[PDB]
Amino acid sequence: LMMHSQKRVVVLGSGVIGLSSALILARKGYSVHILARDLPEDVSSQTFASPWAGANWTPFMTLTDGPRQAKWEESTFKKWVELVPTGHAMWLKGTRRFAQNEDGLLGHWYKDITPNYRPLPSSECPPGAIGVTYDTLSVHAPKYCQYLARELQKLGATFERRTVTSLEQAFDGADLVVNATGLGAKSIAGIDDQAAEPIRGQTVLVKSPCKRCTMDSSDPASPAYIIPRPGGEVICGGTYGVGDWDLSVNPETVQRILKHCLRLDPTISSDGTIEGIEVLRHNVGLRPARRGGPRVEAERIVLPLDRTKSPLSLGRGSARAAKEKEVTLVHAYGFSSAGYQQSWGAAEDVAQLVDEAFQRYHG
Amino acid sequence: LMMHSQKRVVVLGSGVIGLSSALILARKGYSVHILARDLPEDVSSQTFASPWAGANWTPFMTLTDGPRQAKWEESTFKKWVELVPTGHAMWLKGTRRFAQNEDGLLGHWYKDITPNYRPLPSSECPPGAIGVTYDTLSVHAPKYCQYLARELQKLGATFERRTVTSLEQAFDGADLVVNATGLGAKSIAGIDDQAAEPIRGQTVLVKSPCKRCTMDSSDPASPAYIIPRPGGEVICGGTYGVGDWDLSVNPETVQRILKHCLRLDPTISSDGTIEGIEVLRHNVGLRPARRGGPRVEAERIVLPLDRTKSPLSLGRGSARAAKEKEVTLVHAYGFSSAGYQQSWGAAEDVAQLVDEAFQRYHG
Ligand SMILES: [C][C]([N])[C@]1([O])=O[O@@-]23[C@@]45=[C]C([C])=C([C])[C]=C426N2=[C@@]4(C(=O)[N]C(=O)N=C4N5[C][C]([O])[C]([O])[C]([O])[C]OP([O])(=O)OP([O])(=O)O[C][C]4O[C](N5[C]=NC7=C5N=[C]N=C7[N])[C]([O])[C]4[O])[O-]2136
Ligand SMILES: [C][C]([N])[C@]1([O])=O[O@@-]23[C@@]45=[C]C([C])=C([C])[C]=C426N2=[C@@]4(C(=O)[N]C(=O)N=C4N5[C][C]([O])[C]([O])[C]([O])[C]OP([O])(=O)OP([O])(=O)O[C][C]4O[C](N5[C]=NC7=C5N=[C]N=C7[N])[C]([O])[C]4[O])[O-]2136
């Protein structure tokens, strides 16, 4: 007769959001099992977003438009500062950010977070653009997820490859699931979220000692960015193809991205020419976005599902029947272009929802 | 000092085409190694087509439009007949095929292949449609690939998971590669085929003892088909979304497919109603098609690649340089909606090209 945990949770999804959420829960003493199709070793899989990110910290919203996003970003910056000594995050000093106009600088809301924030002179911007410079942070996206997974191993979390088609498959050995499935949320019966949408991102991974980050949103016909990452490499971008599921490399996009990034910073090349860029890989990932913004909230659901709950329910629609339990589903998906930079703060909010649900519903 | 093989080949890709090609080569005494991202155990992976097929034998072209396709189909039918005794293929007796008009019956070219071919009376067709009936064959798509893989194991072929980005990575231990990469052919440097395109197919897998196949192309607003497969299950379709990469399940498509299939055959349900259909899974796969039709041909290529051969070449465009060898690349991709029904005949043509290349170029 042993004393077993009364704090079991399943995390569905093993991208940066599921991993971060799992880790804070494990630290809080929950017994965590991670169920996912794609795991941190899957460093070239296009069926999840996390391998493909820069990943730097670049706020995209005003406070009024994105209050949660700012909270989550501010919290994650603090965490990444703590990771610099051990090399899991890296300073991007003197990052340059260009916008079409003052509005695109988002009210400068993050100016107390990124050190050394200040305007750039027009001489330091693309023609007709406006700019600021500051010190930000980046992580090596696949290696950061693998780090989180090692931390999870030590805290007793376990992992299992599974592809779920209906929610009851996740409510396996726990009465609370964290839904961190990115795009998958649309096609799981009992979630069925039609608002989930991809935002396609093509990049070129380059070998370069360049440690300068440049974020250029001043040309609406050509998104571009240069994001150095731990390790001797730079990610050159990019695209933001809303609703585009295409996983193939566009060769014309390659040329546009490299020409534009070269204009922003010639040192990404050996000799300043497109031909001097040492290309390591051409990449395409689908950012998991959501019309109406990221979903971070707790829902109570009755199982089994019926066709009345979900058009995708399995079995005969004719059912209604069977055993019947109520469970808690804590959503955490739709982070779009900002899942890494929001991940720690989002995870903190997920863990708070789990604590509150446990108090109300789980004894 | 042992006598080693002088007949090494790599097959790049492990869908039905790569597997079939590998198997005929192994039978011919080649030493075959299969390199692929997705292998036959990956029965729910959306990054290749082969898990998702019906798979039945339904010619789609006239002889004049598709001479190779007909050759390949006729050969594969003979092979599948040979597989019926051991349960790897199944007769679909009294299959019904509906078309909008006589032209859609393709000149009846296959009437000596499928037993019991004859016209249907209009009373047996959707209103305004024309029809024929015949006996055809189907295989269980994922299990058929797993069968081929067991046959390959016995003949000494080996497998390795790899995702290739540039052709030299495949020319590993062999001077001849079979390129059976489906959609992947567009994004591998040294192949770069912009004509590769997906054709998206959504289906509903249903549990039903129904053994009747119905193929309905008489409604251009609603493709539909019911394909029984070994095992107690039927695949209900479908869609043909040319150029559509969307991997998510469309709930409105579910309703259209089930309503239309029910009109064609009520016995897919327990009680003849949509609600009586026992749904096992909702599926989306991308057929690997190609503008200009399937590509089955042998090319000679110099390695290393340079930026002049491929916009996606790795390293600096500035290169031209390095060791330099010529190798043989035998293409086998772009089979669209007909890769299973063409697979054996296509493999026979691949193996002939390999024999001829070996004679001319490989000693
Ligand atoms: C500049 C920037 N920002 C940009 O560009 O944007 O972006 C990214 C992405 C991409 C694609 C790119 C190209 C880039 C990048 N970069 C970054 C940065 O820098 N930063 C940040 O922050 N971010 C970013 N990004 C974005 C990201 O990536 C995102 O957001 C994330 O990753 C997201 O995450 P999550 O949410 O976690 O998601 P994922 O990863 O996708 O994962 C999912 C999961 O789940 C699973 N599943 C699904 N479904 C299912 C499942 N399982 C089971 N069953 C079912 N059914 C999967 O598998 C996984 O695990 O930028
Ligand atoms: C009625 C009919 N016909 C229709 O509907 O159409 O179709 C299919 C499909 C689908 C999707 C569906 C839904 C259905 C179905 N079905 C069938 C029938 O019935 N019959 C026939 O014949 N067919 C069919 N189908 C179609 C099929 O599926 C196809 O064609 C095939 O599968 C194709 O094959 P292949 O060519 O082999 O391809 P895949 O599978 O995709 O594979 C590929 C491979 O490769 C690899 N990769 C790529 N990339 C790469 C790689 N590796 C390495 N590296 C790189 N980069 C992959 O992974 C694999 O392995 O019907």
PDB file of N, CA, C and O and ligand atoms in Angstrom, chain B residues 12-18 35-38 47-50 52-56 60 162-164 180-182 184 188 201-203 215 225 227 240 285-288 332-333 335-342, ligand 2:
ATOM      1  N   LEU B  12      15.561   6.552 -52.437  1.00  0.00           N
ATOM      2  CA  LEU B  12      15.228   7.719 -51.626  1.00  0.00           C
ATOM      3  C   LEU B  12      13.703   7.807 -51.615  1.00  0.00           C
ATOM      4  O   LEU B  12      13.099   8.155 -52.644  1.00  0.00           O
ATOM      5  N   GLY B  13      13.102   7.468 -50.488  1.00  0.00           N
ATOM      6  CA  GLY B  13      11.657   7.424 -50.360  1.00  0.00           C
ATOM      7  C   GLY B  13      11.158   6.018 -50.104  1.00  0.00           C
ATOM      8  O   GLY B  13      11.622   5.036 -50.686  1.00  0.00           O
ATOM      9  N   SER B  14      10.190   5.928 -49.181  1.00  0.00           N
ATOM     10  CA  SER B  14       9.638   4.664 -48.707  1.00  0.00           C
ATOM     11  C   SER B  14       8.124   4.630 -48.693  1.00  0.00           C
ATOM     12  O   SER B  14       7.487   3.949 -47.893  1.00  0.00           O
ATOM     13  N   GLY B  15       7.537   5.380 -49.603  1.00  0.00           N
ATOM     14  CA  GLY B  15       6.150   5.189 -49.950  1.00  0.00           C
ATOM     15  C   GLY B  15       5.998   4.021 -50.855  1.00  0.00           C
ATOM     16  O   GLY B  15       6.939   3.253 -51.105  1.00  0.00           O
ATOM     17  N   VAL B  16       4.776   3.798 -51.364  1.00  0.00           N
ATOM     18  CA  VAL B  16       4.534   2.604 -52.184  1.00  0.00           C
ATOM     19  C   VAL B  16       5.454   2.556 -53.403  1.00  0.00           C
ATOM     20  O   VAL B  16       5.828   1.462 -53.844  1.00  0.00           O
ATOM     21  N   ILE B  17       5.795   3.717 -53.968  1.00  0.00           N
ATOM     22  CA  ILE B  17       6.655   3.687 -55.154  1.00  0.00           C
ATOM     23  C   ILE B  17       8.084   3.298 -54.839  1.00  0.00           C
ATOM     24  O   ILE B  17       8.670   2.426 -55.491  1.00  0.00           O
ATOM     25  N   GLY B  18       8.682   3.897 -53.805  1.00  0.00           N
ATOM     26  CA  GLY B  18      10.027   3.557 -53.393  1.00  0.00           C
ATOM     27  C   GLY B  18      10.098   2.103 -52.954  1.00  0.00           C
ATOM     28  O   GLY B  18      11.037   1.384 -53.290  1.00  0.00           O
ATOM     29  N   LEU B  35      16.570   5.125 -47.916  1.00  0.00           N
ATOM     30  CA  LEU B  35      16.711   6.326 -47.101  1.00  0.00           C
ATOM     31  C   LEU B  35      15.382   7.071 -47.180  1.00  0.00           C
ATOM     32  O   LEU B  35      14.928   7.391 -48.285  1.00  0.00           O
ATOM     33  N   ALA B  36      14.745   7.392 -46.056  1.00  0.00           N
ATOM     34  CA  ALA B  36      13.467   8.106 -46.144  1.00  0.00           C
ATOM     35  C   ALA B  36      13.142   8.768 -44.824  1.00  0.00           C
ATOM     36  O   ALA B  36      13.516   8.270 -43.764  1.00  0.00           O
ATOM     37  N   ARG B  37      12.358   9.857 -44.871  1.00  0.00           N
ATOM     38  CA  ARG B  37      11.882  10.490 -43.656  1.00  0.00           C
ATOM     39  C   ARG B  37      10.820   9.690 -42.992  1.00  0.00           C
ATOM     40  O   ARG B  37      10.716   9.504 -41.785  1.00  0.00           O
ATOM     41  N   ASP B  38       9.891   9.215 -43.738  1.00  0.00           N
ATOM     42  CA  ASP B  38       8.646   8.513 -43.407  1.00  0.00           C
ATOM     43  C   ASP B  38       8.762   7.061 -43.910  1.00  0.00           C
ATOM     44  O   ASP B  38       8.980   6.859 -45.114  1.00  0.00           O
ATOM     45  N   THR B  47       3.061  13.635 -43.693  1.00  0.00           N
ATOM     46  CA  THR B  47       4.140  14.139 -44.535  1.00  0.00           C
ATOM     47  C   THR B  47       4.502  13.217 -45.695  1.00  0.00           C
ATOM     48  O   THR B  47       5.526  13.438 -46.382  1.00  0.00           O
ATOM     49  N   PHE B  48       3.663  12.224 -45.944  1.00  0.00           N
ATOM     50  CA  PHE B  48       3.760  11.427 -47.161  1.00  0.00           C
ATOM     51  C   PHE B  48       2.329  10.932 -47.427  1.00  0.00           C
ATOM     52  O   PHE B  48       1.434  11.002 -46.599  1.00  0.00           O
ATOM     53  N   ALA B  49       2.110  10.458 -48.655  1.00  0.00           N
ATOM     54  CA  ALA B  49       0.759  10.102 -49.120  1.00  0.00           C
ATOM     55  C   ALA B  49       0.348   8.682 -48.829  1.00  0.00           C
ATOM     56  O   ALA B  49      -0.851   8.406 -48.705  1.00  0.00           O
ATOM     57  N   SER B  50       1.300   7.769 -48.837  1.00  0.00           N
ATOM     58  CA  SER B  50       0.983   6.362 -48.891  1.00  0.00           C
ATOM     59  C   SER B  50       0.103   5.865 -47.747  1.00  0.00           C
ATOM     60  O   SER B  50      -0.708   4.941 -47.984  1.00  0.00           O
ATOM     61  N   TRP B  52      -2.584   6.964 -46.682  1.00  0.00           N
ATOM     62  CA  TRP B  52      -3.915   7.558 -46.768  1.00  0.00           C
ATOM     63  C   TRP B  52      -4.775   7.013 -47.881  1.00  0.00           C
ATOM     64  O   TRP B  52      -5.949   7.394 -47.978  1.00  0.00           O
ATOM     65  N   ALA B  53      -4.264   6.133 -48.691  1.00  0.00           N
ATOM     66  CA  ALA B  53      -4.970   5.704 -49.892  1.00  0.00           C
ATOM     67  C   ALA B  53      -6.040   4.648 -49.621  1.00  0.00           C
ATOM     68  O   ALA B  53      -6.130   4.000 -48.558  1.00  0.00           O
ATOM     69  N   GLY B  54      -6.901   4.445 -50.585  1.00  0.00           N
ATOM     70  CA  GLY B  54      -8.034   3.560 -50.499  1.00  0.00           C
ATOM     71  C   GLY B  54      -7.685   2.132 -50.178  1.00  0.00           C
ATOM     72  O   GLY B  54      -8.285   1.593 -49.229  1.00  0.00           O
ATOM     73  N   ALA B  55      -6.814   1.467 -50.907  1.00  0.00           N
ATOM     74  CA  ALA B  55      -6.367   1.860 -52.233  1.00  0.00           C
ATOM     75  C   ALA B  55      -6.961   0.877 -53.215  1.00  0.00           C
ATOM     76  O   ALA B  55      -6.716  -0.329 -53.073  1.00  0.00           O
ATOM     77  N   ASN B  56      -7.712   1.369 -54.193  1.00  0.00           N
ATOM     78  CA  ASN B  56      -8.284   0.481 -55.222  1.00  0.00           C
ATOM     79  C   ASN B  56      -7.665   0.784 -56.587  1.00  0.00           C
ATOM     80  O   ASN B  56      -6.846   1.694 -56.756  1.00  0.00           O
ATOM     81  N   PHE B  60      -7.910   6.331 -64.499  1.00  0.00           N
ATOM     82  CA  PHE B  60      -8.383   7.703 -64.633  1.00  0.00           C
ATOM     83  C   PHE B  60      -8.142   8.344 -65.999  1.00  0.00           C
ATOM     84  O   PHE B  60      -8.584   9.506 -66.177  1.00  0.00           O
ATOM     85  N   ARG B 162      16.141   9.377 -42.758  1.00  0.00           N
ATOM     86  CA  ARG B 162      16.974  10.495 -43.121  1.00  0.00           C
ATOM     87  C   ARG B 162      16.080  11.492 -43.855  1.00  0.00           C
ATOM     88  O   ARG B 162      15.270  11.027 -44.668  1.00  0.00           O
ATOM     89  N   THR B 163      16.312  12.769 -43.610  1.00  0.00           N
ATOM     90  CA  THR B 163      15.670  13.800 -44.412  1.00  0.00           C
ATOM     91  C   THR B 163      16.711  14.511 -45.239  1.00  0.00           C
ATOM     92  O   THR B 163      17.552  15.234 -44.644  1.00  0.00           O
ATOM     93  N   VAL B 164      16.696  14.339 -46.554  1.00  0.00           N
ATOM     94  CA  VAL B 164      17.731  14.899 -47.443  1.00  0.00           C
ATOM     95  C   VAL B 164      17.294  16.292 -47.897  1.00  0.00           C
ATOM     96  O   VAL B 164      16.148  16.578 -48.216  1.00  0.00           O
ATOM     97  N   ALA B 180      12.217   8.603 -55.254  1.00  0.00           N
ATOM     98  CA  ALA B 180      10.804   8.320 -55.055  1.00  0.00           C
ATOM     99  C   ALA B 180      10.252   9.144 -53.880  1.00  0.00           C
ATOM    100  O   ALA B 180       9.704   8.634 -52.912  1.00  0.00           O
ATOM    101  N   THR B 181      10.458  10.470 -53.970  1.00  0.00           N
ATOM    102  CA  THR B 181      10.204  11.377 -52.870  1.00  0.00           C
ATOM    103  C   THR B 181       8.866  12.087 -52.913  1.00  0.00           C
ATOM    104  O   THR B 181       8.602  12.945 -52.072  1.00  0.00           O
ATOM    105  N   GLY B 182       7.988  11.756 -53.858  1.00  0.00           N
ATOM    106  CA  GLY B 182       6.693  12.403 -53.898  1.00  0.00           C
ATOM    107  C   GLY B 182       6.805  13.918 -53.973  1.00  0.00           C
ATOM    108  O   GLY B 182       7.512  14.463 -54.846  1.00  0.00           O
ATOM    109  N   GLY B 184       8.433  15.786 -52.024  1.00  0.00           N
ATOM    110  CA  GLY B 184       9.721  16.264 -51.610  1.00  0.00           C
ATOM    111  C   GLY B 184      10.661  16.648 -52.716  1.00  0.00           C
ATOM    112  O   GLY B 184      11.649  17.384 -52.507  1.00  0.00           O
ATOM    113  N   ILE B 188      14.400  19.421 -52.696  1.00  0.00           N
ATOM    114  CA  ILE B 188      15.751  18.840 -52.608  1.00  0.00           C
ATOM    115  C   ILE B 188      16.645  19.517 -53.627  1.00  0.00           C
ATOM    116  O   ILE B 188      16.355  19.488 -54.826  1.00  0.00           O
ATOM    117  N   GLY B 201      -6.633  15.249 -50.334  1.00  0.00           N
ATOM    118  CA  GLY B 201      -7.701  14.266 -50.200  1.00  0.00           C
ATOM    119  C   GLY B 201      -8.098  14.061 -48.756  1.00  0.00           C
ATOM    120  O   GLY B 201      -7.349  13.545 -47.962  1.00  0.00           O
ATOM    121  N   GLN B 202      -9.340  14.468 -48.452  1.00  0.00           N
ATOM    122  CA  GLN B 202      -9.967  14.208 -47.164  1.00  0.00           C
ATOM    123  C   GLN B 202     -10.878  13.004 -47.286  1.00  0.00           C
ATOM    124  O   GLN B 202     -11.573  12.853 -48.296  1.00  0.00           O
ATOM    125  N   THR B 203     -10.860  12.139 -46.253  1.00  0.00           N
ATOM    126  CA  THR B 203     -11.702  10.974 -46.226  1.00  0.00           C
ATOM    127  C   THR B 203     -12.247  10.727 -44.815  1.00  0.00           C
ATOM    128  O   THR B 203     -11.744  11.296 -43.847  1.00  0.00           O
ATOM    129  N   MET B 215     -17.695   4.285 -57.141  1.00  0.00           N
ATOM    130  CA  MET B 215     -16.840   5.391 -57.577  1.00  0.00           C
ATOM    131  C   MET B 215     -17.723   6.390 -58.325  1.00  0.00           C
ATOM    132  O   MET B 215     -18.149   6.059 -59.432  1.00  0.00           O
ATOM    133  N   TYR B 225     -16.671   8.575 -53.209  1.00  0.00           N
ATOM    134  CA  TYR B 225     -16.338   7.176 -53.420  1.00  0.00           C
ATOM    135  C   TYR B 225     -16.441   6.396 -52.113  1.00  0.00           C
ATOM    136  O   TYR B 225     -16.277   6.986 -51.031  1.00  0.00           O
ATOM    137  N   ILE B 227     -14.757   2.865 -50.756  1.00  0.00           N
ATOM    138  CA  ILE B 227     -13.761   1.861 -51.040  1.00  0.00           C
ATOM    139  C   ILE B 227     -13.565   0.933 -49.843  1.00  0.00           C
ATOM    140  O   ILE B 227     -12.884   1.269 -48.870  1.00  0.00           O
ATOM    141  N   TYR B 240     -10.409  16.441 -54.232  1.00  0.00           N
ATOM    142  CA  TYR B 240      -9.259  16.536 -55.128  1.00  0.00           C
ATOM    143  C   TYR B 240      -8.842  18.006 -55.180  1.00  0.00           C
ATOM    144  O   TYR B 240      -9.063  18.697 -56.170  1.00  0.00           O
ATOM    145  N   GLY B 285      -4.807  13.540 -46.458  1.00  0.00           N
ATOM    146  CA  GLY B 285      -3.482  13.305 -47.051  1.00  0.00           C
ATOM    147  C   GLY B 285      -3.287  14.159 -48.288  1.00  0.00           C
ATOM    148  O   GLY B 285      -4.281  14.601 -48.907  1.00  0.00           O
ATOM    149  N   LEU B 286      -2.031  14.394 -48.649  1.00  0.00           N
ATOM    150  CA  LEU B 286      -1.684  15.169 -49.855  1.00  0.00           C
ATOM    151  C   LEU B 286      -1.164  14.219 -50.907  1.00  0.00           C
ATOM    152  O   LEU B 286      -0.063  13.680 -50.773  1.00  0.00           O
ATOM    153  N   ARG B 287      -1.918  14.031 -51.987  1.00  0.00           N
ATOM    154  CA  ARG B 287      -1.435  13.199 -53.081  1.00  0.00           C
ATOM    155  C   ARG B 287      -0.232  13.868 -53.730  1.00  0.00           C
ATOM    156  O   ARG B 287      -0.327  15.099 -53.970  1.00  0.00           O
ATOM    157  N   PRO B 288       0.829  13.160 -54.092  1.00  0.00           N
ATOM    158  CA  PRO B 288       2.015  13.822 -54.675  1.00  0.00           C
ATOM    159  C   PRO B 288       1.854  13.765 -56.203  1.00  0.00           C
ATOM    160  O   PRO B 288       2.119  12.719 -56.813  1.00  0.00           O
ATOM    161  N   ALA B 332      11.191   8.701 -59.965  1.00  0.00           N
ATOM    162  CA  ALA B 332       9.939   7.950 -59.904  1.00  0.00           C
ATOM    163  C   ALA B 332       8.995   8.671 -58.964  1.00  0.00           C
ATOM    164  O   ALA B 332       8.831   8.263 -57.809  1.00  0.00           O
ATOM    165  N   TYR B 333       8.349   9.758 -59.416  1.00  0.00           N
ATOM    166  CA  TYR B 333       7.468  10.551 -58.557  1.00  0.00           C
ATOM    167  C   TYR B 333       6.453  11.273 -59.404  1.00  0.00           C
ATOM    168  O   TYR B 333       6.564  11.431 -60.616  1.00  0.00           O
ATOM    169  N   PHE B 335       2.826  10.536 -58.983  1.00  0.00           N
ATOM    170  CA  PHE B 335       1.794   9.600 -59.362  1.00  0.00           C
ATOM    171  C   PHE B 335       0.379  10.007 -58.924  1.00  0.00           C
ATOM    172  O   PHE B 335      -0.574   9.317 -59.300  1.00  0.00           O
ATOM    173  N   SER B 336       0.226  11.108 -58.206  1.00  0.00           N
ATOM    174  CA  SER B 336      -1.079  11.733 -57.999  1.00  0.00           C
ATOM    175  C   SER B 336      -2.047  10.761 -57.305  1.00  0.00           C
ATOM    176  O   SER B 336      -1.719  10.222 -56.228  1.00  0.00           O
ATOM    177  N   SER B 337      -3.207  10.543 -57.860  1.00  0.00           N
ATOM    178  CA  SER B 337      -4.280   9.710 -57.325  1.00  0.00           C
ATOM    179  C   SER B 337      -4.135   8.230 -57.673  1.00  0.00           C
ATOM    180  O   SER B 337      -5.077   7.469 -57.414  1.00  0.00           O
ATOM    181  N   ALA B 338      -2.995   7.839 -58.267  1.00  0.00           N
ATOM    182  CA  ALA B 338      -2.902   6.501 -58.860  1.00  0.00           C
ATOM    183  C   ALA B 338      -1.640   5.776 -58.576  1.00  0.00           C
ATOM    184  O   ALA B 338      -1.235   4.793 -59.228  1.00  0.00           O
ATOM    185  N   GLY B 339      -0.928   6.120 -57.562  1.00  0.00           N
ATOM    186  CA  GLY B 339       0.333   5.540 -57.179  1.00  0.00           C
ATOM    187  C   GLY B 339       0.267   4.083 -56.758  1.00  0.00           C
ATOM    188  O   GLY B 339       1.177   3.304 -57.072  1.00  0.00           O
ATOM    189  N   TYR B 340      -0.788   3.685 -56.042  1.00  0.00           N
ATOM    190  CA  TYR B 340      -0.904   2.262 -55.720  1.00  0.00           C
ATOM    191  C   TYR B 340      -1.218   1.451 -56.984  1.00  0.00           C
ATOM    192  O   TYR B 340      -0.570   0.420 -57.275  1.00  0.00           O
ATOM    193  N   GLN B 341      -2.248   1.872 -57.735  1.00  0.00           N
ATOM    194  CA  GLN B 341      -2.697   1.104 -58.887  1.00  0.00           C
ATOM    195  C   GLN B 341      -1.665   1.090 -60.017  1.00  0.00           C
ATOM    196  O   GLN B 341      -1.776   0.210 -60.891  1.00  0.00           O
ATOM    197  N   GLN B 342      -0.705   2.004 -60.016  1.00  0.00           N
ATOM    198  CA  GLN B 342       0.375   2.002 -60.976  1.00  0.00           C
ATOM    199  C   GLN B 342       1.697   1.415 -60.446  1.00  0.00           C
ATOM    200  O   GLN B 342       2.664   1.247 -61.191  1.00  0.00           O
TER     201      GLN B 342
HETATM  202  C1  LIG C   2      -9.921   7.229 -55.441  1.00  0.00           C
HETATM  203  C2  LIG C   2      -8.443   7.496 -55.347  1.00  0.00           C
HETATM  204  N1  LIG C   2      -7.681   7.163 -56.452  1.00  0.00           N
HETATM  205  C3  LIG C   2      -8.016   8.803 -54.723  1.00  0.00           C
HETATM  206  O1  LIG C   2      -8.779   9.386 -53.873  1.00  0.00           O
HETATM  207  O2  LIG C   2      -6.899   9.312 -55.056  1.00  0.00           O
HETATM  208  O3  LIG C   2      -5.960   8.575 -53.857  1.00  0.00           O
HETATM  209  C4  LIG C   2      -4.767   8.155 -52.611  1.00  0.00           C
HETATM  210  C5  LIG C   2      -4.235   9.173 -51.833  1.00  0.00           C
HETATM  211  C6  LIG C   2      -5.032   9.879 -50.960  1.00  0.00           C
HETATM  212  C7  LIG C   2      -4.379  11.005 -50.181  1.00  0.00           C
HETATM  213  C8  LIG C   2      -6.352   9.482 -50.716  1.00  0.00           C
HETATM  214  C9  LIG C   2      -7.256  10.236 -49.736  1.00  0.00           C
HETATM  215  C10 LIG C   2      -6.859   8.403 -51.450  1.00  0.00           C
HETATM  216  C11 LIG C   2      -6.088   7.644 -52.319  1.00  0.00           C
HETATM  217  N2  LIG C   2      -6.626   6.482 -52.910  1.00  0.00           N
HETATM  218  C12 LIG C   2      -5.810   5.865 -53.903  1.00  0.00           C
HETATM  219  C13 LIG C   2      -6.334   4.765 -54.516  1.00  0.00           C
HETATM  220  O4  LIG C   2      -7.476   4.248 -54.282  1.00  0.00           O
HETATM  221  N3  LIG C   2      -5.486   4.181 -55.466  1.00  0.00           N
HETATM  222  C14 LIG C   2      -4.237   4.640 -55.805  1.00  0.00           C
HETATM  223  O5  LIG C   2      -3.607   4.079 -56.720  1.00  0.00           O
HETATM  224  N4  LIG C   2      -3.725   5.723 -55.145  1.00  0.00           N
HETATM  225  C15 LIG C   2      -4.530   6.329 -54.236  1.00  0.00           C
HETATM  226  N5  LIG C   2      -4.023   7.418 -53.628  1.00  0.00           N
HETATM  227  C16 LIG C   2      -2.806   7.981 -54.083  1.00  0.00           C
HETATM  228  C17 LIG C   2      -1.567   7.414 -53.475  1.00  0.00           C
HETATM  229  O6  LIG C   2      -1.697   7.596 -52.037  1.00  0.00           O
HETATM  230  C18 LIG C   2      -0.274   8.034 -53.915  1.00  0.00           C
HETATM  231  O7  LIG C   2      -0.168   8.195 -55.319  1.00  0.00           O
HETATM  232  C19 LIG C   2       0.983   7.277 -53.541  1.00  0.00           C
HETATM  233  O8  LIG C   2       0.875   7.007 -52.113  1.00  0.00           O
HETATM  234  C20 LIG C   2       2.246   7.975 -53.824  1.00  0.00           C
HETATM  235  O9  LIG C   2       3.357   7.195 -53.387  1.00  0.00           O
HETATM  236  P1  LIG C   2       4.820   7.741 -53.450  1.00  0.00           P
HETATM  237  O10 LIG C   2       5.057   8.351 -54.783  1.00  0.00           O
HETATM  238  O11 LIG C   2       5.667   6.650 -52.981  1.00  0.00           O
HETATM  239  O12 LIG C   2       4.790   8.973 -52.422  1.00  0.00           O
HETATM  240  P2  LIG C   2       4.724   9.111 -50.845  1.00  0.00           P
HETATM  241  O13 LIG C   2       3.864   8.027 -50.279  1.00  0.00           O
HETATM  242  O14 LIG C   2       4.346  10.523 -50.556  1.00  0.00           O
HETATM  243  O15 LIG C   2       6.178   8.801 -50.322  1.00  0.00           O
HETATM  244  C21 LIG C   2       7.247   9.736 -50.466  1.00  0.00           C
HETATM  245  C22 LIG C   2       8.413   9.189 -49.670  1.00  0.00           C
HETATM  246  O16 LIG C   2       9.570  10.048 -49.851  1.00  0.00           O
HETATM  247  C23 LIG C   2      10.033  10.480 -48.567  1.00  0.00           C
HETATM  248  N6  LIG C   2      10.633  11.762 -48.709  1.00  0.00           N
HETATM  249  C24 LIG C   2      10.102  12.973 -49.215  1.00  0.00           C
HETATM  250  N7  LIG C   2      10.931  13.974 -49.160  1.00  0.00           N
HETATM  251  C25 LIG C   2      12.084  13.452 -48.569  1.00  0.00           C
HETATM  252  C26 LIG C   2      11.903  12.189 -48.313  1.00  0.00           C
HETATM  253  N8  LIG C   2      12.760  11.269 -47.677  1.00  0.00           N
HETATM  254  C27 LIG C   2      13.979  11.895 -47.440  1.00  0.00           C
HETATM  255  N9  LIG C   2      14.246  13.190 -47.661  1.00  0.00           N
HETATM  256  C28 LIG C   2      13.313  14.011 -48.232  1.00  0.00           C
HETATM  257  N10 LIG C   2      13.604  15.297 -48.444  1.00  0.00           N
HETATM  258  C29 LIG C   2       8.762  10.413 -47.714  1.00  0.00           C
HETATM  259  O17 LIG C   2       9.148  10.579 -46.384  1.00  0.00           O
HETATM  260  C30 LIG C   2       8.221   9.122 -48.136  1.00  0.00           C
HETATM  261  O18 LIG C   2       8.996   8.014 -47.657  1.00  0.00           O
HETATM  262  O19 LIG C   2      -6.675   7.386 -54.245  1.00  0.00           O
END
